[PDB]
């Protein structure tokens, strides 16, 4: 059975985002003209939220809970799939192939991804996705 589907959590193994965790927005198994191989459109975390202790102030907690996202087209060979899944309604079709052809569309997509991911992080769920991988 196929596992590289939407809401699949993967690890990036190569590139500037190597070691970061992503969620698959759209799988392209057959490939496209520009990327003639199995690849995926993913959104992930570039800067994880910092740790929060019980004596921190509310302003410090709000400052340290911020997330810097990124969006990416990535080859399947540069992903390590994980058994975890991250189901987010707000990220449905947040990016497509034509998103990466315009710098402003990437900005709007990253703003949407940041909002949805920070909402899920503040909910307290899916803590494995928001903790950084140590390697």
């Amino acid at each position: 059975m196929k596992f590289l589907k939407t809401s699949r959590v993967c690890l990036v193994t190569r590139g500037r985002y190597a070691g970061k965790k992503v969620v698959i927005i759209q799988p392209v198994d057959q490939g496209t003209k520009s990327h003639p191989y199995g690849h995926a459109l993913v959104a992930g975390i570039e800067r994880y939220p910092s740790k929060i202790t019980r004596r921190m102030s509310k302003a410090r907690i709000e400052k340290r809970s911020k997330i810097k996202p990124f969006i990416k087209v990535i080859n399947y060979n540069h992903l390590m799939p994980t058994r975890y899944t991250l189901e987010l309604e707000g990220l449905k079709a947040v990016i497509n192939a034509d998103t990466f052809k315009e710098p402003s569309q990437r900005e709007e997509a990253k703003k949407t991804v940041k909002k949805v991911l920070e909402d899920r992080y503040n909910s307290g769920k899916n803590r494995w996705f928001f903790t950084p991988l140590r390697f």
């Binding site: 929060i52 202790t53 019980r54 907690i61 809970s65 992080y121 503040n122 909910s123 307290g124 803590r127």
Partner: peptide, 29 residues
């Protein structure tokens, strides 16, 4: 209500596990 982002990270001080805590070693000074 406590913050849901607070987490417990217990340390195991058995052999080969996490680094031993600083104990009173005055008997061995």
């Amino acid at each position: 209500p406590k913050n849901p982002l607070l987490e417990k990270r217990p340390r195991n001080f058995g052999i080969g596990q996490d680094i031993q805590p600083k104990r009173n070693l005055s008997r061995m000074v």
